[PDB]
Design a protein around this nucleic acid. Structure first.
Length: 1112
RNA sequence: GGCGCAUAAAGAUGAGACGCGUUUUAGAGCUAGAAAUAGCAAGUUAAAAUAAGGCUAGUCCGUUAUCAACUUGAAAAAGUGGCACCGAGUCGGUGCUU
DNA sequence: CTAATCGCCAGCG
DNA sequence: TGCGTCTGGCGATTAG
DNA sequence: TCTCATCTTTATGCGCCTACGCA
């Protein structure tokens, strides 16, 4: 018999149904293997399948990059120690040894506990002399005496370990340090350059803690937005720039100094308007420098050389003095809340700030009403209102510090002490290279083959220190392979790489493809005609070689005086402007300035290589090294202006698809047929589908399992899981029907890929004409159709009752698609929409991910603390807790339960965590007997992943969730009249239909009132049978019996809220009217060792029962 | 249904870097008493680790995706379960057949 | 001398 | 013969 | 939090290409 399959896809659910021709659902009995006595089970062919949602890979990329950064930081400190070791060995031998075991407790140390100086009096003398590290940095920068070697190492290691960002470009110095002098200098040189209308006329006018747009508004309004001065102000502040109509150039190009391509961009935009304006943009960049050094560096730059250390010690001394002032004020005026502020670690006072765990914002919010309701707090409220009160040094807002500040302080320290230590003067540039070096973003991970993310290549066989980096890795080939490993292959000749977007061949192809299918009508012509090859040649040689953006008005105005000799010409086929344009031709004509050289056909490859070289590389020395092979072709100024050009973009076709293959009947190419065709003017995607030329056979002569094709699809990783489960389910239930392929596959992006993969997987036979025999038929539907079919005949759906709605919607879209294709049945539909047996299957899975929670808890006496290293005991060092279990094992053996080591055959669960599962899979009996068990049964070990299944007495079903945890497994089968009554009573206000029909429905709801009591009886019987949660059941029945006088709609909403008591899955909480009923959690797995484990198939039709009472 | 060009929004994938946060230790607490405790001074910083670890020993890799049971296999993979009819509280019964 | 139950918590800009 | 497509772990507490 | 590179999809405008039921 014929049969059809219907599906309904989601991101957490797949619903499947099998119908015959008369819209029924075939029941069938199945063979059950195992150890019990049930050997046949009658089941219906309708069901669903549930799984948790898939995850993307963004959460695991950041951890990988963080691991790489921590490894490289440790290696930086190792390089510095390897430098200082030989000179440190003469003054204090075990200094690095004391520095590297500082974490251990006093028992586990092997030296003195004071790491820096060894003894105790030198340690307290050092800590009284320098209260922070910044006092030491200012003392080493400013003074001129020979300091101790350990203090120099400590300062250098502190400024290498934390070294600021690299977002600024070029170089800078803190010599400016003034927002007023630079602004006056910029106004002076603007009045020197432009003298027709000068600037109308500092520190706090541009250094406010507000938005950049409002800062630009109050800075420009006090003295327009389309002005050159205003846009230069927005460029210096860092806002969105524009240079379209102010400079009046020929190309609308912005200029943001924060981005990468700015210096060559400024050098290109300089000569486009004049040899002037150089010192103007230099002063604008210097103002953009000095505004960034304002809000982070507030100190007199003439008093001290190192400004950051001075700013830090200013903040520290300010904190100290207003701490003493606040202590005196709170002790005097309000002597009752003193212990709450300066002693209590629980609240958000000062003790919660420093010693507790409070932030700055919560501390200021707590201390605001205390500081307001007092007397004598005038400056403190101002400092709190500008958020500079009681501040720390290492804060959350030091992300603005550039690396040049630490570089300048390091250079000053190395310049000051180099006379007393010779090897410091010998190795200054080595340590400066240690600080300043970073791996470029196109080289990548410096592997040696065993990575799967690396692409770099080497030129030698040695180790890559930061000093010999440029003489080991080839940077040109690595920077080429960084791009070339990601670009698309051609979708017609899959052994060829695509062209750059701005190559001249690609632009010729697009302009001839757009050109050759346009039509024109003159005054007196009969029919619209195409253009000849001479006409297209005149279009290319005259128009497109001068102006890029061509409107149709320019095309009409050119030839009507020029060559057309006709004024009543309408050009049909083009909407008011073109799309393709020879932009690279125009740019190289502005650069190279020789039209006859670009017109020569013998220079095609030698220029397309230049376009490829300008598309790939970004570093200027690489482009110079790869354009040095063209030195005897142009002038010096041409090569000087040539490497400033930069392009980005990759097209869709290869060079072989436009100039490589040949039509063997005629000997011409595709591009030649675009240029000169004949009296057809055919184009691309018409010249390869025609059977005249040989291009169809050539593209056909240039040509994967299920998982590889699923991974070859494009989308979020949730829908890949969804369509893979869909394909597995439909193949399984094709197999279960005697291996007869179905007739119709009705489905409901999700659909647009599964339709193609199902049509490719089902139909495989060919006819005598080598045509695809449509043995099946894949039909796709829209959701509004099944929604209208649900809502017009009162087939109402309530989402919160159970999980049968997936399978019921699958069956419903199946029957409406089959009845639509084909054209007392409603009795059959209402009969099968109340079947009490649907195969719901939660997909079991082995859990994986992180090892535990990431919070590092402090020490306590308990033994649920996972150690953080090998030799760090958790009772003395803290550690993580709450690990995640991968799967459980069912073990049965003897354990030493007795003072005389008495044996006792026990049987229990055991959670294997994610951290130790490899050691369990390697040697199971040795690890399991090191756990504490003895004399185990080597064959009776059963794996149990998350979401297993267990059948109990009277139909009780529980799903395993952890070592000790269970979840509800059964599903409530409510009759259809109660579902219709609940949907109608829930939607009492929103009618959405006919008003007289709504009045009849309201009279129906008013006629049926005891259905609430019947539903309460139903769910109380169900919860007394399978849930065993009598306390919360008592609470909800008392809450129903109390407020049993409400309106019908509010009562219906409160009833359909409380179905979270009985539905499948994890327990949750709910609220009836005001009483909130907490979730009840089953935390015992003692009963589960006397039940029947069910090994269930993918659709749940094949089963394998296992009686666990017969084991052990 | 699928391509090419033009404009726009959204998202994915892969590198390179900053700043915090957390845990132990070091920053000698004083005074009155026999303590239990009380008043008192303080406080801003640093070292180390940041998934346990692995061998292929790299300035590399370690949280993504795939996964019911049983039988072959190193693996990709392959194979393993009768059909109608009457009914329905999580599926039951009858007949034919092996 | 052990099992249920209540309440809290979970790396980020 | 042409036409549109949050839920599990953990401590404190209580029940026994 | 910041810099960089390559892809996909969705929506309008402009050219066409081909399977397949229905007018």
């Amino acid at each position: 018999k014929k049969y059809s399959i219907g599906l309904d896809i989601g991101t957490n659910s797949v619903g499947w149904a099998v119908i015959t021709d008369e819209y029924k659902v075939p029941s069938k009995k199945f063979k059950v293997l195992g150890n019990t006595d049930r050997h046949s089970i009658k089941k219906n062919l309708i069901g669903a399948l549930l799984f948790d949602s898939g995850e993307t890979a963004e959460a695991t990329r950041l951890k990988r990059t963080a691991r790489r950064r921590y490894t490289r930081r440790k290696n930086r400190i190792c390089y510095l120690q390897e430098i200082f070791s030989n000179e440190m060995a003469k003054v204090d031998d075990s200094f690095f040894h004391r520095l590297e075991e500082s974490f251990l407790v006093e028992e586990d140390k092997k030296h003195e506990r004071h790491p820096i100086f060894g003894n105790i009096v030198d340690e307290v003398a050092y800590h009284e002399k320098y209260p922070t590290i910044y006092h030491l940095r200012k003392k080493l920068v400013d003074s001129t005496d020979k300091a101790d070697l350990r203090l120099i190492y400590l300062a250098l290691a502190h400024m290498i370990k934390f070294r600021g960002h690299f977002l600024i470009e070029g170089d800078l110095n803190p010599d400016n340090s003034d927002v007023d002098k630079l602004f006056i200098q910029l106004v002076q040189t603007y009045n020197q350059l432009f003298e027709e209308n000068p600037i109308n006329a500092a520190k706090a006018i541009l250094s406010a803690r507000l938005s950049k747009s409002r800062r630009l508004e109050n800075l420009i309004a006090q003295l327009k937005k389309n002005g050159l001065f205003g846009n230069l102000i927005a460029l210096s502040l860092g806002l969105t720039p524009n240079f379209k109509s102010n400079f009046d150039l020929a190309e609308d190009a912005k200029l943001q100094l924060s981005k990468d391509t700015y210096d060559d961009d400024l050098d290109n935009l300089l000569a486009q308007i004049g040899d002037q304006y150089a010192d103007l943009f230099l002063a604008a960049k210097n103002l953009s420098d000095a505004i960034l050094l304002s809000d982070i560096l507030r100190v007199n730059t003439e008093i001290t050389k190192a400004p950051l250390s001075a700013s830090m010690i200013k903040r520290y001394d300010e904190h100290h003095q207003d701490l003493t002032l606040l202590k005196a004020l709170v002790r005097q005026q309000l002597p009752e809340k003193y212990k709450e502020i300066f002693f209590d670690q629980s609240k958000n006072g000062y003790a919660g700030y420093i010693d507790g765990g409070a932030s700055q914002e919560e501390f200021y919010k707590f201390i605001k009403p205390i500081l307001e309701k007092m007397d004598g707090t005038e400056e403190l409220l101002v400092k709190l209102n500008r958020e500079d009160l009681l501040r720390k040094q290492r804060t959350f807002d030091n992300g603005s510090i550039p690396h040049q500040i630490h570089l300048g302080e390091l250079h000053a320290i190395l310049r000051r002490q180099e006379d007393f230590y010779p090897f410091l003067k010998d190795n200054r540039e080595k340590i400066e290279k240690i600080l300043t070096f970073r791996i470029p973003y196109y080289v990548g991970p410096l592997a040696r083959g065993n990575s799967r993310f690396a692409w770099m290549t080497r030129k030698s066989e040695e180790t890559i220190t930061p000093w010999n980096f440029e003489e080991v890795v080839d940077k040109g080939a690595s920077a080429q392979s960084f791009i070339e490993r990601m670009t698309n292959f051609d979708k017609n000749l899959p052994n060829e790489k695509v062209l750059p977007k701005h190559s001249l061949l690609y632009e010729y192809f697009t302009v001839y493809n757009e050109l050759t299918k346009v039509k024109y009508v003159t005054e007196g012509m009969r029919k619209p005609a195409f253009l000849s090859g001479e006409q297209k040649k005149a279009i290319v040689d005259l128009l497109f070689k001068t102006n890029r953006k061509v409107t149709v008005k320019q095309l009409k105005e050119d030839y009507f005086k020029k060559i057309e000799c006709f004024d009543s010409v309408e050009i049909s086929g083009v909407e008011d402007r073109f799309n393709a344009s020879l932009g690279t031709y125009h740019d190289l004509l502005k650069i190279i300035k020789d039209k006859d050289f670009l017109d020569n056909e013998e220079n095609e490859d030698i220029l397309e290589d230049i376009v490829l070289t300008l598309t790939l590389f970004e570093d200027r020395e690489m482009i110079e090294e790869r354009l040095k092979t063209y030195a005897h072709l142009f002038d010096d100024k041409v090569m000087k202006q040539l490497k400033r050009r930069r392009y980005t973009g990759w097209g869709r076709l290869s060079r072989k698809l436009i100039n490589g293959i040949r039509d063997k009947q005629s000997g011409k190419t595709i591009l030649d047929f675009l240029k000169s065709d004949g009296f057809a003017n055919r184009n691309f995607m018409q010249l390869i589908h025609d059977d005249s030329l040989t291009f169809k056979e050539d593209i056909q002569k240039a040509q994967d399992s299920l998982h590889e094709h699923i991974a070859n699809l494009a989308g979020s990783p949730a829908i890949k899981k969804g369509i893979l489960q869909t394909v597995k389910v439909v193949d399984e239930l094709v197999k279960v029907m005697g291996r007869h392929k179905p007739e119709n596959i009705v489905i409901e992006q999700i659909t647009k890929h599964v339709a193609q993969i199902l049509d490719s997987r089902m139909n495989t036979k060919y006819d005598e004409n080598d045509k695809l025999i449509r043995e099946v038929k894949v039909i796709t539907l829209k959701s509004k159709l099944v929604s209208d079919f649900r809502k017009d005949f009162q087939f109402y759906k309530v989402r919160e009752i159970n999980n049968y709605h997936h399978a019921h919607d699958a069956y419903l879209n199946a029957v409406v698609g089959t009845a639509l294709i084909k054209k007392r049945d409603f009795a059959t539909v209402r009969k099968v929409l109340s079947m009490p047996q649907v195969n719901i299957v939660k997909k079991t899975e082995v859990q994986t991910g992180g090892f535990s929670k990431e919070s590092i808890l402090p020490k306590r006496n308990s033994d649920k603390l996972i150690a953080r290293k090998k030799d760090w005991d958790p009772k003395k060092y803290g550690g993580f807790d709450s690990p995640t279990v991968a799967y459980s094992v069912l073990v049965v053996a003897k354990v030493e339960k007795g003072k005389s080591k008495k044996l006792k055959s026990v049987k229990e669960l055991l959670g294997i965590t994610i951290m130790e599962r490899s050691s369990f899979e390697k040697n199971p009996i040795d690890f399991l007997e090191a756990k504490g068990y003895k004399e185990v049964k080597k064959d009776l070990i059963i794996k149990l992943p998350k979401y297993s299944l267990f059948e109990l007495e009277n139909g009780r079903k529980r799903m395993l969730a952890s070592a000790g945890e269970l979840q509800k497994g059964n599903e409530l089968a409510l009759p259809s009249k109660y579902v219709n009554f609940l949907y109608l009573a829930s939607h009492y206000e929103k009618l959405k239909g006919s008003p007289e029909d709504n009045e009849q429905k309201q009279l129906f709801v008013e006629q049926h009132k005891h259905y609430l009591d019947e539903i309460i009886e139903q769910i109380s019987e169900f919860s007394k049978r399978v849930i065993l949660a009598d306390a919360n059941l008592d609470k909800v029945l008392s809450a129903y019996n109390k407020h049993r006088d409400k309106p019908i709609r509010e009562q219906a909403e409160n009833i359909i809220h409380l179905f979270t008591l009985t539905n499948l899955g994890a327990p949750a909480a709910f609220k009836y009217f005001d009483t909130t009923i907490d979730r009840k959690r089953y935390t015992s797995t003692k009963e589960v060792l006397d039940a029947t484990l069910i090994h269930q198939s993918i659709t749940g039709l094949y089963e394998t029962r296992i009686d666990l009472s017969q084991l052990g």
